[PDB]
């Protein structure tokens, strides 16, 4: 992709959450699978740092309250994107 910028992992991560719609949220593996399937952003998905960026971003996202840790699945949390 001609666009070389760091997307808000939360956007792709959370967006992937709604995409799967997996009951009671979805796991990181399933979430990454959906994003990886995507074709428009294939640039990011194909980007090796795709899984790393999502894995690292997801970790912080939870620490910020962006996502919800519910077992092997994670649900989107609007309470506060920034966190706290």
Curated annotation (Swiss-Prot):
Autoacetylated. It comes from the Eukaryota. It is found in: Nucleus. Residues 5-78 form the H15 domain. Ubiquitously expressed, with high levels in heart, pancreas, testis and ovary. Component of the MOZ/MORF complex composed at least of ING5, KAT6A, KAT6B, MEAF6 and one of BRPF1, BRD1/BRPF2 and BRPF3. Interacts with RUNX1 and RUNX2. Belongs to the MYST (SAS/MOZ) family. Histone acetyltransferase which may be involved in both positive and negative regulation of transcription. Required for RUNX2-dependent transcriptional activation. May be involved in cerebral cortex development. Component of the MOZ/MORF complex which has a histone H3 acetyltransferase activity. It is linked to A chromosomal aberration involving KAT6B may be a cause acute myeloid leukemias. Translocation t(10;16)(q22;p13) with CREBBP. Ohdo syndrome, SBBYS variant: A syndrome characterized by distinctive facial appearance with severe blepharophimosis, an immobile mask-like face, a bulbous nasal tip, and a small mouth with a thin upper lip. The condition presents in infancy with severe hypotonia and feeding problems. Associated skeletal problems include joint laxity, abnormally long thumbs and great toes, and dislocated or hypoplastic patellae. Structural cardiac defects are present in around 50% of cases, and dental anomalies, including small and pointed teeth, are common. The N-terminus is involved in transcriptional activation while the C-terminus is involved in transcriptional repression. This is Histone acetyltransferase KAT6B. It comes from Homo sapiens. The chain holds residues 100 to 182 of 2073 of the full protein.
């Amino acid at each position: 992709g001609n666009d070389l910028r760091n997307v808000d992992w939360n956007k792709l991560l959370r967006r992937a959450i709604e995409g799967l719609e997996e009951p009671n949220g979805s796991s990181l593996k399933n979430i990454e699978k959906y994003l990886r399937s995507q074709s428009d952003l294939t640039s990011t998905t194909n980007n090796p740092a795709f899984q790393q960026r999502l894995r690292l971003g997801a970790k912080r996202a939870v620490n910020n309250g962006r996502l919800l840790k519910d077992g092997p699945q994670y649900r989107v949390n609007y309470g506060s994107l920034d966190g706290k």
